[PDB]
Symmetry: C2
């Protein structure tokens, strides 16, 4: 069949632009014995792609995951109609030998969008789950500071915190996202772009300090939060989105004297560290909390594979409310 594919025409300089992407059309070969042909239903765009694109050669397909369905099959374990998670990149059709695929939860109901398998009940949600429960290690009652809180990771971090008995403080970059998070049960939410002083806003948000810091942003924002950590405070380093598009050198590191005196623990992680039983268990817990209403979700769905570069750029700028998903 035919397929459309987004490739990296030019390595990004600062924020990506439209000319950095090129759409190519091609004819895929026939299926070989044991292979399947997959048709993309929903594709995701995520901040990590900004970092990962730097390792590609120009002309290479953009990396990324998708929900797809088997439309032709020479693999009896993956008959036509099967829905799978696949990571062929930004492409509408692809061929897989079945080994790099992942079926959805067998209990996946029709009452939630399939696209949540790329979001709250997918890798972003699993990232919040392990970053909070394992890396931060919350037990109950802690005060958690989480930035980029309106994204699919931060929004799930705060809600898992709330249903575990923890106070939550969230930072976002738009008053529109401020209201969205209050509805989700966040104790405090503020717009970091507009607050007069971040240090004063954080101190008022919790004069007692912060036990845990789920950090997606990094940079100067993290230095301010670090100064307000309690002793033995834990920092989960999930991302540094504020530096991914940087043209200049990295900002100053956190004041080492504070870090040592407070004896902070700071561990970075990637969701792929957990597999097997641990990963399956977390997925089921996320699905359960979605059905029970403890974890709400919101999506920004963009129609058209042709608009994937636009969805990626809007997502990086925070212009989209909810998980940015492209519908093929």
């Amino acid at each position: 069949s035919m397929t459309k594919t987004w490739t990296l025409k030019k390595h990004f300089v600062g924020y990506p632009t439209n000319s950095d992407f090129e759409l190519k059309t091609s004819e895929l070969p026939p299926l070989k014995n044991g292979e399947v042909l997959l048709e993309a239903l929903f594709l995701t765009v995520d901040p990590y792609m900004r970092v990962a694109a730097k390792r590609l050669k120009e002309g290479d397909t953009m990396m990324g995951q998708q929900v797809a369905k088997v439309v032709e099959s020479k693999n009896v374990a993956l008959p036509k109609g099967t829905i799978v998670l696949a990571s062929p990149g930004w492409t509408t059709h692809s061929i897989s030998d079945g080994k790099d695929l992942e079926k959805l939860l067998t209990e996946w109901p029709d009452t939630i969008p399939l696209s949540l398998a790329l979001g709250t009940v997918g890798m972003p949600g699993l990232t919040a789950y392990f970053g909070l429960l394992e890396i931060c290690g919350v037990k109950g009652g802690e005060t958690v500071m989480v930035n980029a809180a309106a994204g699919a990771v931060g929004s799930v971090v705060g809600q898992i915190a709330k249903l575990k008995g923890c106070k939550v403080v969230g930072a976002v970059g738009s008053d529109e996202k401020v209201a969205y998070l209050q509805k989700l049960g966040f104790d405090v939410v503020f717009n970091y772009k507009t607050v007069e002083s971040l240090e004063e806003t954080l101190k008022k948000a919790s004069p007692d300090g912060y036990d845990c810091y789920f950090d997606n942003v990094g940079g100067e924002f993290s230095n301010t939060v670090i100064g307000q950590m309690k002793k033995f405070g834990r920092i989960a380093i999930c991302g540094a989105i504020s530096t991914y598009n940087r043209t200049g050198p990295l900002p100053p590191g956190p004041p080492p004297e504070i870090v040592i005196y407070q004896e902070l623990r700071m561990e970075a992680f990637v969701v792929y560290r957990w597999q097997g039983d641990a990963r399956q268990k977390a997925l089921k817990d996320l699905l359960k909390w979605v059905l029970e209403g403890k974890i709400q979700y919101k999506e920004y769905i963009i129609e058209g594979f042709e608009n994937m570069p636009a969805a990626f750029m809007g997502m990086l700028k925070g212009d989209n409310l909810g998980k940015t998903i492209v519908k093929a």
Copy 2:
């Protein structure tokens, strides 16, 4: 009784200079019931004093620990002749009620200098012990990077690593210190002030990266080490000496894409976190290893209390081979 005290005349700018200190003489009050008069035998100078001095008021005594002897006693628990660790600051004589004192290990032998209680078999050695064995969590076979490696901390870090079955790489500030660490069993030792490229020297010392980083220095040196940590590498943040005498703005932080991609664990600590049986067992272990030859030591004894500022400045600049101690 009379005493001499070194005070902070002016807050340091960059490295200290002789004019930043002022020696004073005073008359101590009579011993009340339950008190002792302590005569300093050995006083230590250590890098942390540079940071702590910023919090002092001008005129205040410089902080620090000493090995002292009871020369007059109204406390039956501390008779005349008892050797204690005390922290009255840079002073030759002081009065204590006994609650803030620490007796030496009951098994302390007459075959080692008493000044080791301020070094290898004191707080520097305990910092190396807990930092390496618990914060880094060396298990045997790992490769360890330790800077400020010729100090009492770094020298103990490397030798505990050697006796636990690890490969050890050490950076130092002078050619003379390179030879000393070679004799102690360090696998690789180098002078970071004279190498063409820090990145290349570290690569050659361990082409496959570093499992553990015992960090006393921070700054740019640590950014380079972080770029060569293995996946799940662990960093014990003990000090940030490169920033203590800094004059310019703080250096950039570590590249978070490397920290996240490698999933590094980075925890700061201070030796006071461990007390009681844990601290006492560590001290006995250090004493054992010294008596077995598994931990060699070197001291740079400067004679004269009047030379304590010079000892402190030479120690800060890397001029002294071995733990800097002032003999009263």
